[PDB]
């Protein structure tokens, strides 16, 4: 409703860097808000793409940002009669970034790994990896839960069980309030998908450079399965956290699996031991239900509600014809121990191929009416196909079915405006929560500042 689309702020990265692919707000130890931005195709030392991360100080005029430096060199360790190898070329560092406390977590889902032993090898595969930083102190750490030292032949002899070689850990990420990092790894267990969790504190205290394979004892990975419903499910394509079981001492995980059950798609709510509490099934095959998930109480009853995006959903139209427009589903959490029911509301895209629901950002309470609000991206939506972000306001019964405001992309065609989103933080400290929108195709980020309401809705 009250985001200001007249006076925007633009941050920019190098051309071809895909600056804006992921982003998040970051508060330093003093409460000063900055913007962390991933650029997964930024050039590295060997003039080859390795990705990078930028930490942009807040400034109404925007501009260029300083880099947040991480080690980009490939590593080798000869130990235990084996050879450990990391490969950072095209690893996509910055394909996901998240901030918690004064720590920044930036991931490289396509970092490759291999182990040699004489003439045998583990196989060169994308285990992924995460880089952690405490910008103010300079502390650095890494976390790569899927690295192993098992040789190829052993997997074959064991029928490829517990095969974490293609995890792509860091594909998605989130941090609990208590400071537990949760990584989505959609390629885990031979493309079933897995989750890896470990406390940030323990990741830092157990990491040392040069080791490559080390133990994080407090970590916890999810499980392999023999059920074909999970095969190629990409469980962990997206992740989030929230409170869904009524017990405030426990934190629940929300995990998207867009191709679960022969591309029907699904979203699961789990306890911190990876036991399944709820499962929401997709409505239409290949719609990519679970592509994106968001947790936020939208109807002001104090109970977290779930939003699920299915960007490729095909809407039924006249003459038995289907039209790919994308769709978002809202599930309101019921009182006490009960199962989430049918969706409470369905939001559907209008523009063909717009991919409405590709990203969903909680905005907090944008218009300050007592109800939390959301933004939904359609990266190729709008009448011109350039991209659109739509704002929906919360209400006692859920969300309004019509957008209160529409943000058209200020960038040229192909920018993917809206592919990444983040709200619910007041960056200029004017008392209203603001919205940052990534457009990796144009290597830029746009900041929309919320202002006082003109006429209320």
């Amino acid at each position: 409703l009250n985001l200001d689309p007249v006076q925007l702020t633009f941050y920019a990265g190098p051309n071809g860097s895909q600056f804006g692919f992921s982003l998040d707000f970051h508060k330093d130890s003093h409460g000063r808000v900055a913007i962390v931005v991933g650029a997964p195709r930024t050039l590295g030392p060997s003039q080859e793409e390795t990705g990078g991360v930028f930490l942009c100080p807040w400034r109404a005029e925007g501009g260029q940002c300083p880099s947040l430096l991480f080690d980009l060199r490939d590593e080798t360790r000869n130990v235990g009669s084996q050879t450990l190898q990391t490969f950072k070329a095209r690893q996509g560092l910055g394909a996901s970034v998240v901030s918690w406390s004064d720590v920044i977590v930036a991931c490289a889902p396509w970092q490759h790994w291999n182990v040699l032993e004489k003439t045998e090898e583990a196989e060169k595969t994308p285990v992924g990896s995460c880089f952690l930083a405490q910008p103010e102190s300079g502390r650095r750490a890494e976390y790569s839960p899927c690295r192993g030292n098992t040789l190829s032949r052993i997997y074959v002899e064991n029928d490829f069980s517990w095969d974490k070689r293609y995890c792509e850990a860091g594909f998605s990420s989130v941090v609990t309030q208590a400071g537990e990092l949760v990584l989505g790894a959609p390629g885990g267990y031979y493309f079933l998908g897995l989750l890896a969790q470990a406390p940030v504190a323990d990741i830092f205290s157990s990491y040392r450079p040069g080791i490559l394979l080390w133990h994080v004892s407090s970590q916890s990975l999810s499980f392999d399965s023999s059920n074909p419903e999970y095969f190629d499910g990409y469980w962990g394509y997206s992740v989030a956290v929230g409170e869904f079981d009524g017990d405030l001492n426990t934190t629940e995980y929300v995990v998207g699996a867009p191709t679960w059950s022969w591309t029907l798609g699904a979203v699961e709510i789990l306890d911190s031991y990876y036991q399944r509490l709820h499962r929401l099934r997709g409505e239409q095959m290949a719609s990519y239900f679970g592509h994106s998930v968001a947790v936020t109480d939208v109807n002001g009853d104090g109970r977290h509600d779930l939003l699920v995006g299915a960007p490729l959903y095909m809407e039924s139209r006249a003459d038995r014809k289907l039209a790919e427009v994308g769709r978002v589903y809202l599930f309101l959490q019921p009182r006490g121990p009960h199962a989430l029911g049918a969706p409470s509301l369905l939001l559907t895209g209008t523009q063909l191929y717009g991919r409405f629901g590709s990203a969903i950002a909680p905005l907090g309470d944008l218009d300050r009416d007592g109800y939390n609000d959301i933004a939904v991206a359609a990266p190729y939506g709008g009448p011109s196909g350039r991209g659109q972000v739509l704002v929906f306001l919360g209400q006692s019964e859920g969300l309004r079915s019509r957008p209160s405001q529409v943000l058209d992309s200020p960038f040229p065609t192909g920018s993917a405006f809206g592919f990444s989103l983040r709200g619910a933080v007041d960056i200029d400290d004017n008392g209203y929560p603001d919205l940052i929108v990534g457009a990796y195709g144009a290597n830029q980020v746009a900041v929309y500042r919320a202002q006082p309401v003109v006429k209320a809705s």
Partner: antibody
Amino acid sequence: EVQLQQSGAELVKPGASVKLSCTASGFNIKDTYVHWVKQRPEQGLEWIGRIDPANGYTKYDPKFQGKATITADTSSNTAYLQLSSLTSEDTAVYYCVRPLYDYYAMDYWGQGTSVTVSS
Amino acid sequence: DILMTQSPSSMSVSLGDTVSITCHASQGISSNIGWLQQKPGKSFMGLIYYGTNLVDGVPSRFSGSGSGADYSLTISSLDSEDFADYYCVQYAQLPYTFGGGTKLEIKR
């Protein structure tokens, strides 16, 4: 806190067999490699082998091949070292060891199990 | 098998002293070395891993250094508890091999 409780002092006759145990305390035996080390006053410290309790795969110093057999039971959070056809030279103190962080290191040690072979 | 030649086999020193135990391997082991402490009539405690990294709980007066095939454990300002046996171990290759050991004794 990580603690490795090994079995009590063993006293056996030559030609017999003995099976030492190492029970994990404060952690899951499955977490890391588990090594076995032999200590004698004169010969010093010798690495016998290791096992990955998760899958049971083992490695040995060829010197102990046939003599030593390493196993593990994740159910009882215990690792074992079985010695066969014992002799005077097998009289020594035996330790179970695991790393702290580094996969390949040797940082945590059990209290040790004394083994005496005599007629 | 890699050979670990540890020296000296023993040394007589006093409290407050800064001593150094060296270890030489028959080939390069790229910092894949650990240092161990055995107090009289007791078990082993890890001190260092991967050449220079202190094990959790170990005082900073202990430090490790070196590269290639030559490494050193150093104890600044010896304490009464530091009089014990010290062993180096390499894990660059299987089988793991240990040093001959070093006993720190009180000088009188």
